[PDB]
Amino acid sequence: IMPQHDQLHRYLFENFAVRGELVTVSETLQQILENHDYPQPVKNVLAELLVATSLLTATLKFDGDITVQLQGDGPMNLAVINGNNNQQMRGVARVQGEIPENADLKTLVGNGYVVITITPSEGERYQGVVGLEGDTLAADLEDYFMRSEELPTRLFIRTGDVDGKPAAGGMLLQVMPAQNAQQDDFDHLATLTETIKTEELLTLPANEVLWRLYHEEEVTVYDPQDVEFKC
């Protein structure tokens, strides 16, 4: 009973009113990077977007589409993943200039934002525009969620190489809404998961990674879910 391939799982911390999710998108990635000749720095934000988008997605009670993009006046005007609630993802980047060998994100992009737009099959749409104050996409998103959302959320995104092939995964924690969850416990959990090793995350069976961190906790593991490339 053990294969190999991208997946995202959900879990809730019973006595803590905080849910979390771990995910790997290294395969669906190989697919999005292939065909282009993208500089390291770009293959990175994308791995970064990809994961981010994934996790956002898995957290929203919807059904339809969503695009997450990075806009601005960098050499890379554009970068965007597109995916739905069935975690089927694809994306492209948009290079138009000089790209500094070891490029930073503020450097990689303009003064742009991140746009999160959702278009659910049947109903109103949702726009989320977050500025790039913070220095990590993962950060800007947490912060967005602090401000424009008032829901504490932490993103843990690791990017790297497994078997020469680039590979990416990530983790999420976030206050369960209107259940009065004590910031504390969370900070602890966050403190706990910060320790996660890109290495572990990317090569180690999720169930184990979850154990290695949350074993001492009352966890409720929901059914997993695939993540995959689209057309």
From Swiss-Prot:
GO CC, sorted alphabetically, is: cytoplasm; cytosol
The record describes its post-translational modification as:
Under oxidizing conditions two disulfide bonds are formed involving the reactive cysteines. Under reducing conditions zinc is bound to the reactive cysteines and the protein is inactive.
The UniProt GO MF terms for this protein read: identical protein binding; protein folding chaperone; unfolded protein binding; zinc ion binding
Q: Which GO terms describe its biological process?
A: maintenance of unfolded protein; protein refolding; response to heat; response to oxidative stress
Main subcellular location: cytoplasm
The domain of life is: Bacteria
Keyword Disulfide bond carried by entry: yes
Annotated compartments: Cytoplasm
Provide this UniProt record's keywords sorted from A to Z: Chaperone, Cytoplasm, Disulfide bond, Redox-active center, Stress response, Zinc
Q: Which parts pass through the membrane? A: none
Induction (record text) = By heat shock.
State its role.
Redox regulated molecular chaperone. Protects both thermally unfolding and oxidatively damaged proteins from irreversible aggregation. Plays an important role in the bacterial defense system toward oxidative stress.
What family is reported? Belongs to the HSP33 family.
What protein name is recorded for this chain? 33 kDa chaperonin
- The source organism is Escherichia coli (strain K12)
Q: Which gene encodes it?
A: hslO
